[PDB]
Symmetry: D2
Subunit: 333 residues, 4 copies
C-alpha cells in the first residue's frame, strides 16, 4: 500500500487537501493517509512551524501532499522559519512545475511542458549582505548541484513522449556561474543518449514561451530563473491558480499547489481545488501509478470543460461541488 502524508497547512489548504484526498480515494488505489500539520497556525500552537511529529510522518511515507502556508508579509516573527531546517533535512532539490493546456478562458492550446529548477536549501543558503549603502546577494552554482538537477530533469525528459530537454542559461553574460551549470548538465546528458538536448539563452526562451510555447517539452534552469519562466508559462494557462507543483529528492517528495494560503477567501468554501488535485495526480505519477494519474487528470479536464465553475473561473459554485463532480467523472474513466 502507498503511504501518503497529508499536510493542509493554512487557509485554503483546509479545503483543497481534503478535496484532493477524496479524488485520490476515488481512484480505488491501495492508499494509506497519514495526517500531519505545518504552517503559520501550527507555529502559533507548538512554537514551531514544523513539529518533530510532522518530520517523522513525512519520512515514513512514500510521498507527501501539502496545501499552502501563510507567509508573514507584514513582519518576520521569532524564527517562524523553522521550515528552512526541514528543507535541509529533506533536501528535495528538484522543483518541478508542469505547464499544460486546460479547457479554461485565456488558455493557449497545445502546451505540455515541464520546468525544472533546483532548491538549494538541502545544500546551502545563498546569502545576502548589506554593507552601508551597498547590498550584495550571492547567486551560487556548484558542480554537484548542477549534476543532480540536470540528471533529474533528464529523467523527467526520458519518461515523456518527446524526449526533449532545453537547458536555459545565461552563460553569455555569466561565463563562470551559468557556464558551469551549462557544461555540467551537458556532461550528464551523455548518460541519456535517448534524450534530445538543446541549449538556449534564457532570454530567447522567454520570448519563445510567449510566441510558441508548444516547442518545449522539459526545460532545465537555475533558480530565480525557473520561477520567472514558470510565471510567464502560467500566464498562458490562465494564471497561477491552476498550477500544480512538486519538490523532489532522492528518497521522497512533496507535492503542492503553487497558490498561497489565500486567507481572504478561507473558510468560505469556494477556493478551486484543481491545483491540489493536479498536484496529487503528479504524486501518483511519481509513485508509479502513471495510468491512474492520467485518469485523474482527464477527470479534472472533463470538469473544467463540463462544469461547474468556481469564482476564480467565472462562476459561483462551491469547492465541495467541484470535488464530487471530479470524483464522479473519475468513476467514468
Amino acid at each position: 500500500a502507498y503511504r501518503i502524508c497529508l499536510i493542509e497547512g493554512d487557509g485554503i489548504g483546509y479545503e483543497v487537501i481534503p478535496a484532493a484526498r477524496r479524488v485520490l480515494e476515488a481512484t480505488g488505489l491501495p492508499l494509506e493517509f497519514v495526517e500531519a500539520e505545518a504552517g503559520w497556525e501550527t507555529f502559533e500552537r507548538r512554537g514551531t512551524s514544523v513539529p518533530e511529529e510532522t518530520v517523522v510522518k513525512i519520512l515514513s511515507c512514500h510521498a507527501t501532499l501539502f496545501g499552502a502556508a501563510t507567509i508573514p508579509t507584514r513582519k518576520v516573527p521569532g524564527f517562524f522559519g523553522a521550515i528552512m531546517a526541514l528543507r535541509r533535512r529533506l533536501d528535495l532539490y528538484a522543483n518541478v512545475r508542469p505547464a499544460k493546456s486546460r479547457p479554461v478562458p485565456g488558455s493557449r492550446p497545445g502546451v505540455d511542458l515541464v520546468i525544472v529548477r533546483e532548491n538549494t536549501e538541502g545544500l546551502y543558503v545563498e546569502q545576502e549582505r548589506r554593507y552601508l549603502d551597498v547590498a550584495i546577494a550571492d547567486a551560487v552554482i556548484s558542480k554537484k548541484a548542477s549534476e543532480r538537477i540536470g540528471r533529474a530533469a533528464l529523467r523527467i525528459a526520458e519518461g515523456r513522449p518527446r524526449k526533449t530537454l532545453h537547458i536555459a542559461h545565461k552563460a553569455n553574460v555569466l561565463p563562470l556561474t551559468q557556464g558551469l551549470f551549462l557544461d555540467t548538465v551537458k556532461e550528464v546528458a551523455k548518460d541519456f543518449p535517448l534524450v534530445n538536448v538543446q541549449d538556449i539563452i534564457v532570454d530567447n526562451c522567454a520570448t519563445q514561451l510567449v510566441m510558441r510555447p508548444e516547442r518545449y517539452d522539459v526545460i532545465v534552469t537555475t533558480n530565480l530563473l525557473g520561477d520567472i519562466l514558470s510565471d510567464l508559462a502560467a500566464g498562458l494557462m490562465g494564471g497561477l491558480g491552476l498550477a500544480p507543483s512538486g519538490n523532489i529528492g532522492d528518497t521522497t517528495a512533496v507535492f503542492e499547489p503553487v497558490h498561497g494560503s489565500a486567507p481572504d477567501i478561507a473558510g468560505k468554501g469556494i477556493a478551486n481545488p484543481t491545483a491540489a488535485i493536479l498536484s496529487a495526480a503528479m504524486m501518483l505519477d511519481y509513485l508509479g501509478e502513471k495510468e491512474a494519474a492520467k485518469r485523474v487528470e482527464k477527470a479534472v479536464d472533463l470538469v473544467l470543460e463540463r462544469g461547474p465553475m468556481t469564482p476564480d473561473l467565472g462562476g459561483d459554485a462551491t469547492t465541495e461541488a467541484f470535488t464530487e463532480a471530479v470524483v464522479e467523472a473519475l468513476k467514468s474513466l
Copy 2:
C-alpha cells in the same frame, strides 16, 4: 541646431541608419549629422572597435544613433574591450526598452509600455568568482544606483499620458538587495506626486504581462529581471525585429535597434528600417522634439498598416521602397 552622431555599425547598419537619417531629414528639423564608425568591421580595419575619433564625436553631439555590432562567433579575438571602456566612460546607466503594439502580424494589440533597468558598468563590474567546484556571481544593489534609475524611470513615466510606474522587484525573497532597490525608488517617487507608483513582485508582473499587458505603462526593475521582462514583452510583439532602444546617461544618449547586424542579408536591400526609425523617434523625443517624434511614429505605423511590406513582414518590398513610403507619409502627418 542639434548635433546627431551617426554610427552605422555592422551588417544591415549601413542600410537602416541611412534610412533613419532620411526620415529625420524629412521632418525639416535643424539637424547636424556627424558620421562616426564602430563595431566588428571597424575593428578589422583599425585594430579597435571604438576609435578615439568616434568617442570624441559621440561626446560632441547631443545624441547618437547607432545601428548594430556583429558579435564574433567564438573567442573575443582579439579583442573589443574598447566597447567596455566606452560603456564605463559614458555611464549611460538607463536602459530604455519600449514595447508598443504595431499593426503587423503576430503583434498583440493594446500594449504600450516601457521597461527601464540600469546598466551598471559606469559604476562597477559585478564580479564572478569560482572556488574549486563552487561558483558565485555577485548581484549588487546600491542606494546611489537605485536612486538614479528610479529617477530616470519616473521622468519617463511623467512625460507620458497614463502617469503610471510599477516597480518590479524580488523583496519577498531578497529583502536586503531588492528591498534596498524597492525602498529607494519609493523615496524618489516622493518627488513625483503626479506619477502613480505601484510596486509588484516581478514574478506576478510576468504573469500579468502575458495575461493583461495593457495595465502597465512604465516598469522599473533591476538588471537581469528587466531583460527577461523585455523578452516576454518582445514575445507579445512577435519578436525583436521592430523594437527600438535607448541607453541614456546624464549628459547624452545612444539610441539603437534591439536587433543585430544580420550580416547574411547585408547589402540585399531587404532589411526592415522600422526599429532604427523608431529609435530615431525615441531620440527626437529625448532631444525635446516630442511632436516631431510622434509624427515619425505615426508615419511608421501607417506604412506598417498599408505597405510596402519587407520580407520580415511577409512581403517582397525593399528597404528603399519602405523608407520612401515613410518619408512621404511623414509630410502629411
Copy 3:
C-alpha cells in the same frame, strides 16, 4: 562632576574594580559612581548578560569602567547576544590598546605605544559563508569606517608628545580593501598637520615591533591585524596581566583591563589591580583629566617598582596591600 558607570563583571572584577574606584577617589576629583551589573554571573541571576537598567546607566554617564566577563566553556548556552546588541547600539568603534614598559620582570624597557583599530559591529556584521566544502569570510573596508578610525587614531596621536602615527596596512597585496583604508587615513591626516604620519606594510611593522619597538607611538591598522600587533606588543610586556584598554565612540567610552575574569582565583585577594587602575587612568585622560591621569600612572609605576608584589609579579602581597600603596603613593605625586 563626572558620572562614572562602574561595572564589576565576573570573577576578579569584584576585587579589581573597587580597587580602581579607590584610586580614582584618592585623586579628589568630583566623581559620581553609578553601579551597574553585567556578564556571566549576571546572566545566571537575570536571564540576560546586559540588563536594560545597565544600558540606561551606561548612557547616562560620561564613561564606564568595566572589569571582565567569564566566557562559557562550550556552547553559548543560552545565550548572550545581549552583549552583541549593546555593541551595535553603542557603536564604540575605536579599540584602544596601550602598550607601555612597566618596571616589572619580563617587561622590555623603552616601549610606549598605542594600537588603534575599529570595532565593526556598530556598522555591520562581517559575514561568513560556507558553500559545500568552500568557506568564505568577508573582510570589509569602507571609506566611512576608515575615516573615523583614522580620525580617532590621529586625535590619540595629537594628544601625545611624539606626535607620530604609523598606518599599518596590506595595500601591497590587497590594493582594493587595504588601499581604500590607507588612502582614506592619509586624507584625514591632512587635517592633522602637527602629526607626523608614516605608512608601513603591516608585515614589516611586526618585525620592527620586535626589533625596534621604541620608534613607534600610535599605530592605526585594520581589525585582525591590530589584534596580532597588540599580541606581539603584549609579548614584549611579558603578557596581558597589566594591559589596560578602551573602546571609544562619539559620545561615550568603556574602559576595561585586557585580562579575563580569572574565576579560579576570585575571592582570594591576590588579583593584581594594575590593569583596572591603568584603565581608570585612560578614562581620566579621556574625560579631560590628563594631569590626574598621569598622576595615577605614576603611582602605579612607583608601586610596581618598590612593592608590594602580588603573586603574578613574583611576590606574596595581597590585592588590598597593593591598592593601599597606590592610594598612598598618589597623594605625593
Copy 4:
C-alpha cells in the same frame, strides 16, 4: 644526479644565486645546474616575466633555486603578472619558513621552528571587490586545501626530532572558515599518530613567539597569518635578510630567500648571500641529502661566528669573500 634549476631573477639575485651555486658545488654532490630566467628584467626582453623555456626547465628538474624579483610598486604594467599563470601550473601549495637561531646581533638563542602556510594560487585566486565606497576581500578556506597543507606540515613535523605541530587559527571569531581549517587538519593528524598535535588561537601564538619562541617546532596556519607570524619570528633572528624559504608542491619545489631584489645595492657586491645559501640547504634537505644539508648549515653558522661581516651585519666585507669563506668552512666538515 640531482638536476637543479637556477633562476637569479632581479637585482641582488645575480649575486646571491651564483654564491649559492658555488657552496652547492663545494658539497661534492652529483649536481647538474640548468639555468633559466624570470622576473622584471626578463619581462622587459621577452614580453613575459616567465618564458615557456623557464617553465619547461623547472619541470625537468628535481628542484629550483630562485633569487628575487623586482616588484613594481610605482605602478602595475601591462600584465607583468604572468608569474600568476606559473603559480597555477606549479601548484606549490606549501609555503615553508624556518626561523632558527643564528650567531648574529639581536638573535634569540634556542630557537628552531618552522611555519607552514598555503599558497592558494594553484587552486584559486582569492578575489577583492570594490563597490562604490565599500570594498570586500575574500578569505577562502576549502577542505581540500586544508587537507593537503595540514598533511604537508605533518610530514615536516614527523621528520623533525620533537615531532610537534601547533595549529594556529582564529576559529573563535571565524567559526565557519577558520573552524573548517582547524577541524580538517585535526582529521588528517589522526594519520600521523607519532606527531604531538596542539591547537592555539593565533593571538596566543603571537604572544608566545615573542616571550618563548623555543616552545614551537612546526606551526601550521592559514594565509595573511603565517606571514605575520613569520615576520614576528624573523624579528627574533635579526630581520628578514637572513631568512630562507621554500614553496613546495607534490612534484617539485622552489627555494628562495625571503628578501627582495634590493635594486639599491645591486651590482655593488655586498649583499649577504646567507639567505640564499640557507635556501639551497633547505633544498638539499628536501631532496634527501639531509646530512649534506646539515653540513652546509654549519658551514654558514661558522662564518656568521668566525667572520667576515657584510654591511647588513655591521661590517664592510664583500659578497664574494663571504662565499669563499663559507666554501672553505664546508671543506672542513
